[model samples]
Target: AEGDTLISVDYEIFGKVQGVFFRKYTQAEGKKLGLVGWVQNTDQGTVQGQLQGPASKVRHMQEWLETKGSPKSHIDRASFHNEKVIVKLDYTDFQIVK
Candidate 1:
């Protein structure tokens, strides 16, 4: 944890995301950062999730999600909101929610 604070956020990623294993890579990235959250594809042709972790790591994940994927995925837009500072994490591991 590089930052003294912990935060949680809901994020939405749009464009060329589905069928590209977006959720799979997202799970890997989140695990690598020791983050707790879930990522999944939306019916609206988007991918979204909740990310919770140290502020620094969450920022890293946010940046990673913007451009990093299964190589075939092309990201058009990534947005994060509903940010809230939290005292504890509610998840034991990051996962790809169906």
Candidate 2:
């Protein structure tokens, strides 16, 4: 199995991720994947969020963040930081924040 241990990563999505319910849909997808974290719109007008789970699934979600997004949304680039191996999940469910 890949990344069976829980992990966490902070992500920033570039491009026009502000319009539409991008963060909302992201929450849907994250919950669908059984991920835990929070997403929010950045002060710089970008989608800034953090996701935590197995690395394999997290990468899958990042791909969605990179190449796919909520309908009516556009994505250019997605970068990750603070990727870490954790002992447990911090959140019980994925959430969209202010």
Candidate 3:
């Protein structure tokens, strides 16, 4: 309940996040946590993505990504930038970008 407005976070995950079930598993977890956003493989050769949601939950997600939520892919580093956004809240579940 930190913030109700949409908060955007630019995230980069380093590790074996590539060529594995990282994205797939992240999608499942995102939807379960009710986060909105999209993820894509970065041109710089890293797993980069964005997510928008409550501050607390988003922070929690970040923690998960750095810990248990991390897939078999070993995450060497994870970073993010959070920004406020104006958007309606219609999603009650998280989903992967299509």
Candidate 4:
């Protein structure tokens, strides 16, 4: 784990995210990438999640997520944040946040 680069970003994912198993897809990808954080839906029908991991891998995943992450899911925007925070493991599994 030493020498590994970790970064955090605020991602705002949009398009066909709801009612399409997007959370499950993201959870699987997140676990695969060793990413930690959470995903939630906004009133505007966008799904946003905070992701943290190695820079290169995270960027790779981000690109993938923007393209083929979920079936019928199209990412209109994926924003990155320069700020960092102490992220705690809050869920054993990812679920739709109501």
lDDT of 1 at 24: 84
Who wins the lDDT comparison?
A: 1
Off by over 4 Å in 3: 1-5, 85-98
Q: Residues 2-92, candidate 4, lDDT per residue (tens digit)?
A: 1256666677786777778788888788878777767787888888877676666667667877787687677676665653533344445
Q: What is each predicted model's overall lDDT from 0 to 1? A: 0.89, 0.88, 0.71, 0.69
Candidate 2 steric clashes: 0
lDDT of 3 by residue, 14-62 (tens): 8777777777778777777778776666666678777778777777778
Q: What are the per-model C-alpha RMSD values against the true structure?
A: 1.6, 1.4, 2.9, 3.5
Better model by lDDT: candidate 3 vs candidate 4: 3
Q: Give Cα distance to truth, residue 54, candidate 3, Å.
A: 1.6
How many residue pairs clash (N, CA or C atoms closer than 3 angstroms) in each of the candidate models, in the order given?
A: 0, 0, 1, 0
In candidate 1, where is summed lDDT lowest over 10 consecutive residues? Answer: 1-10
**lDDT (Cα, 0-100) at 92 in candidate 4:** 54
Candidate that would win on TM-score: 1
TM-scores of all predicted structures: 0.94, 0.92, 0.76, 0.75
What is the overall TM-score of model 4 with all chains considered together? 0.75
lDDT of 2 by residue, 27-90 (tens): 9999888899999998898998899998789888889999989998889889899988998888
Shift of residue 74 alpha carbon in model 3, Å: 0.2
Clashing pairs in 2: none
